[PDB]
Amino acid sequence: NELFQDVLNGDGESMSNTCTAYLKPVLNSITLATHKYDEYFNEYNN
């Protein structure tokens, strides 16, 4: 997220899309991992 703002005030959206697309797959990977952890946490809570 800070990198998603670090370029945002850096070059002004002519460059943030490239960095976002470069870091997309690892972002969906950690998002899926955190979502799986959260849903197993809610499953064991219930």
Partner 1 sequence: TTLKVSNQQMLQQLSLVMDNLINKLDLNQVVPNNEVSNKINKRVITAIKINAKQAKHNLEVKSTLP
Partner 2 sequence: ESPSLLTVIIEIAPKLWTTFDEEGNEKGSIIKVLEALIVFLNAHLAFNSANKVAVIAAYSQGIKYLYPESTSALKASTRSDLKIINSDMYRRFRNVDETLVEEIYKLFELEKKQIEQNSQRSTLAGAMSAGLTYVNRISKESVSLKSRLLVLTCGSGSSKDEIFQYIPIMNCIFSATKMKCPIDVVKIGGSKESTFLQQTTDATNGVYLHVESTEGLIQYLATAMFIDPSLRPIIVKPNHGSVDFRTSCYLTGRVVAVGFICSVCLCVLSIIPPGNKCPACDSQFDEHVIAKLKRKPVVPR
Partner 3 sequence: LPVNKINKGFTLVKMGFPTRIFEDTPTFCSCHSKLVYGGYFCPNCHSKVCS
* Least distance (Å) between residue 22 CB and partner 2: 23
- The one of partner 1, partner 2, partner 3, none whose footprint includes residue 44, by CB under 5 to 8 A per kind, is partner 2
- 22/37 Cα distance (integer angstroms): 25
Distances in whole angstroms, Cα of residue 14 to Cα of each of 29, 32, 33, 42, 43: 25, 28, 30, 40, 43
Quick one: what does residue 34 bind among partner 3, partner 2, partner 1, none, with the CB cut-off 5 to 8 Å set by partner type?
none
Give contact residues for partner 2 (rule: CB under 8 A): 37, 40-41, 43-45
